[PDB]
Amino acid sequence: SVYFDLGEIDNTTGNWDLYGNDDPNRYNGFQNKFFETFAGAFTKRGLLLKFLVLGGATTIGYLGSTSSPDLLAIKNGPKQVPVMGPRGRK
Amino acid sequence: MTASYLPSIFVPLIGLVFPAITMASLFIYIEQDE
Amino acid sequence: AHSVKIYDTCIGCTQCVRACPTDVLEMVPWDGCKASQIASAPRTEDCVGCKRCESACPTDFLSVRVYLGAETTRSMGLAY
Amino acid sequence: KYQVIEPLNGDPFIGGFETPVTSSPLIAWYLSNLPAYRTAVAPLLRGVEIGLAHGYLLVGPFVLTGPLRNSAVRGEAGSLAAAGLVTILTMCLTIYGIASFKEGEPSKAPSLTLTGRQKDADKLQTAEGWASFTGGWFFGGLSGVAWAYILLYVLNLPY
Amino acid sequence: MFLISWRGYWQELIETLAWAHERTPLANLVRWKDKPVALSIVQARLVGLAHFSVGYIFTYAAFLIASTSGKFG
Amino acid sequence: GPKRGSIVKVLRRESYWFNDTGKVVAVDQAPGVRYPVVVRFDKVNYAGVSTNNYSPDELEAA
Amino acid sequence: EVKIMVEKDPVKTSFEKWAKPGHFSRTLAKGPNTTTWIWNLHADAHDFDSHTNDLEEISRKVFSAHFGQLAVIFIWLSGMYFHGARFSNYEAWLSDPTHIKPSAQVVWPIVGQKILNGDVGGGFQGIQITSGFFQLWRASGITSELQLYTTAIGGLIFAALMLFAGWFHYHKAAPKLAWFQNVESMLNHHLAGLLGLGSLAWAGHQVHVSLPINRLLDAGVDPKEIPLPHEFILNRDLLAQLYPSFSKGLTPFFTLNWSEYSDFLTFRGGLNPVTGGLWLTDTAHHHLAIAVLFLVAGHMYRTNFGIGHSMKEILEAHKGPFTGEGHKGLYEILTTSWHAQLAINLAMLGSLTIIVAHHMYAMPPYPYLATDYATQLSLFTHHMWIGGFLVVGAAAHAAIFMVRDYDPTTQYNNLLDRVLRHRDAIISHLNWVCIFLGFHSFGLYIHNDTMSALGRPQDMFSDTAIQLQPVFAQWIQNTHALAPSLTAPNATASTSLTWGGGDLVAVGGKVALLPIPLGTADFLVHHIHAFTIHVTVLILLKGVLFARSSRLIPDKANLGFRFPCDGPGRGGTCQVSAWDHVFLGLFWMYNAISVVIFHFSWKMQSDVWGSISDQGVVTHITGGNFAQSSITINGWLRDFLWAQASQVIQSYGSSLSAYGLLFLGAHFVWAFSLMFLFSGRGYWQELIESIVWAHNKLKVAPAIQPRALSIVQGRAVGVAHYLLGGIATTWAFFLARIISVG
Amino acid sequence: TPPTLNADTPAPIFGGSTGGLLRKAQVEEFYVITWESPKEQIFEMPTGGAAIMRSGPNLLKLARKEQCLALGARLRTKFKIQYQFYRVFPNGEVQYLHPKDGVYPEKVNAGRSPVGVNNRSIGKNANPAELKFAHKQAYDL
Ligand code: CLA
Ligand code: CLA
Ligand code: CLA
Ligand code: CLA
Ligand code: CLA
């Protein structure tokens, strides 16, 4: 009937976890082993940020450089004649 | 334009990658208590 | 963290402490005006900058002055 | 069925309600059985699952409506854009983990259940936990984008 | 927007936006470090003046260049 | 200090009534009062009050 | 129980309280020390519930003020009728309503303004009016200036009468609080008596005078040869010449054999093919039905005659599981607080004004109304603005009630309490949906603009590129188009010509109405309308809910409804009251209504109006460029603002010169508003000191000390000037365009 | 005077609200207010809505200090009820704040020290141009 206490302070501050599934294992052990041996080295954040930046740099480089003529419009260039200057300029 | 392959190399490396890395560096420097 | 000050012109109107909605200003014995009362700001760590204090002192210019300084959680009035 | 609205955990002095939307048997079951709320499972597996789901769903709004949605490279451009989005999100997750988590703090996660049972906090709110989550999410997103592209623009069963 | 409306509205809006962020599942795993607050008073005046000035400069630079160079006198 | 009902002109540099005149009401003659003179003016200030107390060395022109 | 209650002579009429300017409130009755007394005098001149505290005097003052307002409205109406009688080309208009421009105002020749009296036709010279009074008088059966003169006098009489009542019921016989509180009998009498008998009387007037006169006007006879409106009352045979059903006397009505009244009591959709308006034989039937509807609906609530409902047992009976204690304690709210009634009344009246503005343009009820484009546009814009103002007023008064009339000691009745107890959820979700709507409405326009700017129109959101056809509106149109065959077997035609069904109707050249198409350009603008309305509701509802308290200021109700700010503390608390939320919502209401009226103007000039020629070819005014050019903001800039604004700007030296002048005048007023909207009181109060110094130097110091406007009056002045400038600019632009090109 | 000590008194009847505690109350300070009433009335909550206080002792925990002072002023003015409120830390360290010496800050009291009191008129502080490269501001002197 009382909603305060100094001992159980977490009961009187709303620190409960409203949705907690304490299940320790949900997937196939073989599949988990085959997933952690491949996505395990990606844990090192210090060696992942400097990997992502270089990957993205080289990716937008190769794709930015080795593009296609039909795909891009700024790469296909002008294929017509230029209009003239309103005051007889070029 | 002599090269004409450099504008395809630099503006992707200066309007996309440069902000992407400097914003991350500055966010790490801002949100740290030392 | 704001800085409250009480200069020696308070006539002991007690309105400053009645108005402050944070229990910051309190009365104190100090002879000299009429009734040996003066204001005092011991709990400046709780002032938000309401300036309700200054809007009450009926002195010539003022006798209680709030100077807005470093901002904190208590002074910002946050509840989240 | 009498009065379906209740305060949180029967405590009126917290900011919310136990409406049929938040608190309900079906809703609580569906929300507890999500990988981000399964507590004891290792963060890497949850990250893998979540990245798989997200990378698999993301190929849609990129291929159907793109700048090259009317070419022979229809699906490839959208798949590449999806992979770019997932690596960008991986970078954001990494910088969030660096800025928000320390390598000495035990856990910021809640520890109690809905009835005050002294359970254990989620290991996801650790620095290494978030690092594993980010790696698993990167891998899952890439694999999901690749699988979506394989199913769409390599095989049969159009939609 | 920054010169007509003042802070006490935006702070009382952010105070419920923060509630809405805290009381939702699947999105309270993330968490802000810096408490979100409304822009200050002088800061609001500064941002408003900056927007006003940038717009004032741009919509006239564009006009003076287009109306002239499009005719060249 | 000055007499009752005397018209004195203020010299307090941070007063709304600086260089203005006002008639004394009643100067308190206690031993330790720092601003005993009480003067009422015929024009309110930004706050709306018209009475204020000064020290005898802070206002006199007759 | 229910009886007459009056207190004989509660206030002696005199001039004593008249000589003392401030008398209602004791705080400012003393006198003007500073110059912020002249201002708040007029500010709280009408704050009846602020001067005193008893509901009785407040109610009496409210009653007498209503009577004064009615007197002013009567003077206005009598003036309009007298002008239509004395300085109007009405009789000439009646002989040729398709070539004579209406006009009921002339200008004295003094300083060259004589040229405002343009050549409107019929040998007349005056400003061309757009009130639509000529069409109303033609539909009423008025056919001579004499018949106007009299009614003018009539109005004047009522004016005096109203004034008399206004004095009487405050000074000789004023009621007491217990009399006003009888809401059951009040609603009984407003339903059965005011609306029911009023509709019945107007149906009588229609069926007796307005039908034969208008029918003879449609048969092409001279408006002077038409018999007078009483030759059809004292001669049933002269009236039966048109509707022979009258030959059957009043017998069909009493033997329930009144299916023989199908001559003048019809049910036919569409418009009259020669006047471009509804069939008066249909509006007579409509009013006859509405009258009996309201009459039988005026017997619901209980009086001292035993039977009837009571609007307290009705309320408490509705109390469900989800919603606490139901509607309990609301009958106590709406009978002991004038503000909680004004809120509902203003909201409903504003919404009703919007409904009226939407109905009248689509079903023109007056002859030659759809033809005159200027009148049909003004009647839309004016009513839209009125409704937009009234809804914001409703919000403001709900906030006032919540601030100083609500109390919890009786409001444990968990309906208002429950909605007050999840405001942090209501406002959060409204904020999210506002953001979602804003993005998915305006970002589409920005997309279209960027694409059409990048030379790639194939990626736009046009009707040729990716399409956004509104399917639900099209389905509703197709459903109403087929109603007179399946879901309305007795109605001969659809209710309106705007539905996809039907065909075109002409009124001698210019077109009246036709089926309106709906494409992507309409989808986008409808979503924009929804977004702006949602933002306005967000601001107003946030103000109303947080009028009492919030996390920032838990004791805001102690400060009051109207106050600038609670200090520069807590980071800053400027514009934190409900008055400031109304201040902020006025601008968004202005935005919304301006977008609506722009939509209507362009869509009508582009896809509805025009002038058809023989063989059927119809060319709209702009040329149907709304479906393609309204998908980009640049299109609204050039094809609507730049293009259509080309009539007002070059109107100098013509009869449309005043519009060209008021264009720039309203621009100046709008820009003037920014001085008050951007600045603040401290700078001006300081600057005023350096002027008071120069005044003292020359002994011209006023005794009323010149203080600067309060922090709230600055905002009030700013928003007032802003709204005046904007609305007057749009007024001048719309009129100068449509008068010349319509 | 010995500051009053907290207890486990009951709480007022309230159906809930969305203006209650937040995460700030479990990682930082939070406040709790108590009082004594002679009957069962209906009082307005400083967080929105109404609640029926109980007879005898009542205890209410809020999220700020200004909320407690607002509610307490409303009590002392409308119901004539005396009250106190504390501040509780995450680690359960109660701190007694408002009636620090029993008497409210309006009435004078012996054994009170003056803080922030300057022995001069406000218009006498030195300019901010002599105390430069010296962090004394203008008024701490
Ligand atoms: C401040 C001077 C300045 C500015 C505004 C620009 C602007 C531009 N250059 Mg550029 N450039 C400059 C100096 C400058 N250049 C110099 C000195 C060189 C010789 C090394 C070049 C060589 C160069 C190449 C080879 C190319 C450009 C290109 C471009 C365009 C795309 C941006 C880009 O890729 O930059 C890339 C910039 C560099 C690779 C070198 C930067 C040069 C100096 C060191 C930067 C100056 C620092 C600056 C003052 C500090 C800014 C502070 C600010 C953030 C507050 C853009 C119009 C591209 C283009 O033509 O696209 C159409 C392109 O391909 N630039
Ligand atoms: C909100 C407004 C809006 C919208 C809807 C679009 C839409 C679009 N833009 Mg666009 N644009 C906009 C504003 C907008 N624009 C603005 C303001 C600008 C100027 C800054 C531009 C500039 C621009 C350019 C320059 C280009 C586009 C392009 C495009 C197209 C592809 C974009 C893409 O890959 O999206 C991918 C979308 C996603 C990855 C996310 C999809 C969102 C998902 C479906 C939400 C699902 C929520 C879900 C239902 C919630 C329920 C959950 C439950 C199941 C549990 C698409 C039609 C491109 C184009 O060529 O178009 C033809 C292009 O090149 N835009
Ligand atoms: C026969 C003449 C007469 C006389 C001598 C009085 C005398 C009095 N009346 Mg009274 N009254 C009268 C007629 C009269 N009344 C009528 C006809 C009405 C019905 C409308 C009222 C309704 C009325 C009310 C409701 C109240 C009074 C009150 C009063 C007392 C104070 C009035 C005062 O100082 O305000 C003088 C006010 C004015 C001079 C303002 C006049 C403005 C008029 C009414 C409206 C004009 C609008 C006009 C169209 C302009 C529109 C805008 C324009 C700029 C474009 C005083 C005893 C008040 C009272 O006793 O309360 C203590 C009070 O509350 N009277
Ligand atoms: C049924 C209609 C109605 C009624 C009866 C009331 C009644 C009231 N309102 Mg209200 N209101 C309404 C509609 C209504 N309002 C609408 C539609 C809005 C939205 C804009 C508001 C917004 C509003 C606010 C924001 C406030 C009120 C207040 C009040 C109260 C005092 C009003 C007063 O003294 O004004 C005195 C009248 C004036 C000072 C006149 C001001 C001049 C106006 C602004 C300019 C008119 C321009 C004109 C059309 C043309 C200009 C050009 C010409 C002048 C040359 C009073 C109970 C006040 C209050 O505290 O309530 C208790 C308050 O603060 N109302
Ligand atoms: C043109 C000026 C302007 C604009 C754009 C806004 C915009 C907004 N106001 Mg607003 N306001 C203004 C003037 C303006 N205001 C003025 C003058 C006033 C004084 C009366 C107000 C008063 C006011 C109030 C009182 C309220 C708002 C609210 C809002 C928001 C509504 C949510 C929404 O639709 O989001 C949609 C946002 C947009 C359409 C902005 C454009 C976004 C573009 C299309 C996307 C760009 C793409 C990408 C992000 C660009 C990246 C750039 C990077 C690469 C460098 C929105 C941010 C409401 C709010 O907060 O609700 C949330 C609210 O309550 N305003």
Angle at G275 between CA G273 and CA G277, to 5 degrees: 85
Residue pair G419/G402 in contact (Cβ under 8 Å)? The answer is no
Our CA angle for G630, G635, G641, nearest 5°, is 105
Residue G266 to residue D47: CA distance in whole angstroms: 72
Q: Which two tokens stand for residue B6?
A: 């450099």
What is the distance, to the nearest Å, from the Cα of residue G380 to the centroid of all Cα atoms in its chain? 9
E12 to chain H, any CB pair closer than 8 A? The answer is no
> How many residues in total does chain D contain?
159
Place of tokens 């992942």: A48
Q: Is H87 in a helix, a strand, or coil?
A: strand
Rounded distance, CA G489 to CA G483, Å? 8
DSSP G121: S
**Do G422 and G331 touch, CB atoms closer than 8 A?**
no
Q: Which amino acid is at D91?
A: M
Of G148, G87, G149, G143, the residue nearest G120 (C-alpha): G87
Q: How far apart are CA H119 and CA C10, in angstroms?
A: 11
Q: How far apart are CA G24 and CA G40, in angstroms?
A: 12
Tell me, what CATH number does D62's domain have? 1.20.1240.10
Distance between Cα E55 and ligand 5 center (Å):
16
Are G381 and G525 in contact, with CB atoms under 8 Å apart?
no
Identify the three-state secondary structure at position F56: helix
Are residues G91 and G696 in contact, defined by beta-carbon separation less than 8 angstroms? no
Q: In this structure, what token pair is assigned to residue B5?
A: 């392959």
Q: How far apart are CA G104 and CA G81, in angstroms?
A: 10
| Residues facing residue C27 across a β-bridge | C39
**3-class DSSP assignment, residue H122:** helix
Q: Are G258 and G482 in contact (CB under 8 A)?
A: no
Alpha-carbon distance of G628 to G622, in angstroms, equals: 12
Exposed / middle / buried, residue G128 (Cβ in 10 Å: 0-12, 13-18, 19+): buried
Q: What is the SS3 assignment for H44?
A: strand
d(CA F24, CA F37): 7
In a domain, D104, yes or no: yes
The whole-angstrom separation of Cα G312 and Cα G622 is: 57
Interface of D with A in 114-153 (CB under 8 A): 114, 116, 119, 122, 128, 131-132, 134-136, 138-140
Cβ-defined contacts of H48-51 (< 8 Å, 24+): H48/G420, H48/G421, H48/G423, H48/G548, H48/G549, H48/H17, H48/H18, H48/H19, H49/G408, H49/G417, H49/G420, H49/G421, H49/H14, H49/H15, H49/H17, H50/G408, H50/G409, H50/G411, H50/G412, H50/G417, H51/H12, H51/H13, H51/H14
> In whole angstroms, what is the distance from residue G70 CA to residue G80 CA?
15
Q: Which helix (H) or strand (E) holds H30?
A: strand H30-37
Q: How many CA atoms lie within 13 A of G253 on its CB side?
A: 7
- The 8 Å CB, 24+ separation contacts for G404-408 are G404/G557, G404/G560, G404/G561, G405/G337, G405/G339, G405/G340, G406/G548, G407/H44, G408/H42, G408/H43, G408/H44, G408/H49, G408/H50
Q: Select from C80, D113, D100, G547 the least CA-distant residue to E23.
A: C80
Q: What kind and span of H or E run contains C37? A: strand C37-40
G314: Cβ contacts below 8 Å, ≥ 6 apart: none
F37-40 and F51-54 as β-strands: parallel, antiparallel, unpaired?
antiparallel
Q: Does G549 touch chain C (CB under 8 A)?
A: no
- Measured in residues, chain A has a length of 90
Residue E2 has a CB neighbour count (10 Å cut-off) of 17
Q: How far apart are CA G473 and CA G519, in angstroms?
A: 10
**C with A: touching (≥3 Cβ pairs within 8 Å):** no
Say how far apart CA G557 and CA G406 lie, in whole Å.
10
User: Of G646, G634, G633, G639, whose CA–CA distance to G603 is shortest?
Assistant: G639
Question: G439 CA distance to ligand 5 centroid (A)?
Answer: 9
Cα–Cα distance measured from residue A3 to residue H60, given in angstroms and rounded to the nearest whole number: 9
Q: Which residues of G212-233 are buried (b: 16+ CB within 10 A; e: fewer)?
A: bbbbbbeeeeebeebeebeebe
Interface contact C52-G567, CB threshold 8 A? yes
DSSP string covering H80-129, please? ---EEEEEE-TT--EEE-TTTTSS-TTS--SS----SEESS-GGGPPPTT
Extract the runs of DSSP E, i.e. beta strands, from G153-196.
Answer: 173-175
Q: Does residue G78 contact residue G155 with C-beta atoms inside 8 Å?
A: yes
Question: Is G423 part of the contact surface with chain E (CB cutoff 8 Å)?
Answer: yes
| Cβ count near D98 (within 10 Å) | 20
Q: Which chains touch H (3 or more CB pairs under 8 A)?
A: A, C, D, E, F, G
Using DSSP, state whether G404 is helix, strand or coil: helix
Rg (CA), chain B: 15
The Cα–Cα gap between G630 and G600 comes to 12
Q: What are the residues whose beta carbons fall under 8 Å from the beta carbon of G613, sequence distance 6 or more?
A: G619
Whether the Cβ atoms of residue H48 and residue H98 lie closer than 8 Å to each other: no
Write A28-33 long-range contacts (CB < 8 A, 24+).
A32/D42, A32/D45
User: Judging by beta carbons within 10 Å of its beta carbon (0-12, 13-18, 19+), is residue A82 exposed, middle or buried?
Assistant: exposed
H contacts of D8 (beta carbons < 8 Å):
16
**What is each CA distance from G391 to G44, G378, G395, G582, H79, in whole angstroms?**
22, 20, 6, 11, 39
SS3 H118: strand
Q: C39 with C6: CB under 8 angstroms?
A: yes
Residue for token pair 């991350």 = B24
Tokens of D14: 């917290």
Query: Around Cβ G147, how many Cβ atoms within 10 Å?
Result: 16
Contact (CB, 8 A) for C77 and H64: yes
Written as one letter, the residue type at G490 is: N
The total number of structural domains in chain H stands at 1
Contact G287, G199 (CB under 8 A): yes
CA distance C74 to G338: 41
Cβ G398 vs Cβ G340: under 8 Å: yes
Q: Which of A19, A86, A89 sits opposite E70 (nearest CB)?
A: A86
Which helix (DSSP H) or strand (DSSP E) does residue C27 occupy? strand C26-29
Alpha helices in G363-453 (DSSP H): 373-404, 416-420, 423-438, 444-453
Per 3-state DSSP, chain C is made up of helix, strand and coil in percentages (nearest 5) of 10, 20, 70
C-alpha span between G148 and G137 (Å, rounded): 9
Tokens 């949605």 correspond to D69
| Residues H91-100: contacts with CB under 8 Å, at least 24 apart | H91/A9, H92/A6, H92/A7, H92/A9, H94/A6, H94/H6, H96/H3, H96/H4, H97/C23, H97/H65, H98/C23, H98/H68, H98/H69, H98/H72, H100/H3
Q: Which residues does C54 contact at the CB level (< 8 Å), separation at least 6?
A: C62, C64, C65, C66
DSSP-derived secondary structure letter, H98: T
Q: Which residues of F25-50 are buried (b: 16+ CB within 10 A; e: fewer)?
A: eebeeeeebebbbbbebeeebebeeb
H117-118 and C3-7 strand pairing: parallel
Q: What is the 3-state secondary structure (H, E, C) of G33-96?
A: CECHHHHHHHHCCCCHHHHCCCHHHHHHHHHHHHHHHHHHHHHHHHHHHHHHHHCCCHHHHHHC
For chain H, the C-alpha Rg in angstroms (whole number) is: 20
Token pair recorded at residue G394: 């409703």
Contact assessment for residue G39 and residue G709, using Cβ atoms and an 8 Å cutoff: yes
Chains C, E: CB contacts under 8 A, how many? 11
Per the entry, the structure determination technique was cryo-EM
**A65 Cβ partners below 8 Å, 6+ apart?**
B5, B8, B9
**B with F: 3 or more CB pairs under 8 Å?**
no
Token digits for F39?
């003067």
Q: Say how many domains are in chain F.
A: 1
User: Which residues form the domain of F13?
Assistant: 1-62
Nearest Cα to Cα of residue D80 among A64, B22, B13? A64
Cβ-count burial G35-49 (b if 16+ within 10 Å, e if not): ebbeebbebbeeebb
Pull the structure tokens for residue D80: 């590449």
Whose tokens are 């444990």? That residue is G412
The Cα–Cα gap between D128 and G49 comes to 65
Closest C-alpha among G367, G347, G364 to residue G356: G364
Contact predicate D28/A19, CB 8 Å: yes
What CA–CA distance (Å, rounded) separates D27 from E18? Answer: 23
- Specify the resolution in Å: 3.2
> Which residue has the CA at smallest separation from atom 21 of ligand 5?
E1
Position C66, amino acid = V
CB G568 within 8 A of CB C49: yes
Phi/psi of residue G458, each to 5°? -65, -15
Other Cβ atoms within 10 Å of G307 Cβ, number:
8
Give the rounded distance of the alpha carbon of A14 from its chain centre. 33
Bridge partners (DSSP) of residue H17 are D15, D16
Name the packing angle between helices G711-741 and G657-678 (round to 10°).
Answer: 160
- Between CA D95 and CA B32 the distance in angstroms is 11
Q: CB neighbours (10 Å) of residue G335? A: 18
Angle at alpha carbon of residue F53, lines to F50 and F57, rounded to 5°: 130
Q: Which residue has the tokens 């988590």?
A: D101
Distance of CA D82 to the CA centre of its chain: 16
Give the Cα-Cα-Cα angle G63, G64, G65 (nearest 5 degrees). Answer: 90
Nearest by CB to residue E25, choosing from D31, D99, D124, is D31
Chain B residues contacting D via beta carbons under 8 Å: 20, 24, 27-28, 31-32
C-alpha–C-alpha distance, residues G381 and G601, integer Å: 9
CB atoms within 10 A of CB A58: 11
Dist CA D60 CA D152 (whole Å) = 10
Distance (Å, rounded) from C-alpha G412 to C-alpha H15? 11
Most H CBs within 10 Å: which of F14, F16, F37, F59, as the mutation test of the H interface? F14
Indicate the residue of A16, A21, A70 with minimum beta-carbon distance to D110: A16
- Which residues face H13 on adjacent strands? H52
Residue type, H8: D
Number of Cβ within a 10 Å radius of residue G362: 14
CA distance G502 to G285: 23
Residue G145, φ and ψ in degrees, nearest 5: -60, -30
Q: Which domain holds residue D75?
A: 6-154
Q: For chain D, what is the domain count? A: 1
Span from the CA of D79 to the centroid of ligand 2 (angstroms) = 16
Number of H helices, E strands in chain E: 2, 0
Q: How many residues does chain C have?
A: 80
Q: What are the phi and psi torsion angles at C57 (to 5°)?
A: -65, 110
Report residue G295 CA to chain centroid gap.
26
Smallest Cα–Cα separation from G585: which of G541, G544, G540? G540
Examine residue D1 and state whether it is found in any structural domain, yes or no: no
Residue that is written with structure tokens 């309990």 in the block: G328
- Ligand 5 centroid, distance to D146 Cα (angstroms): 38
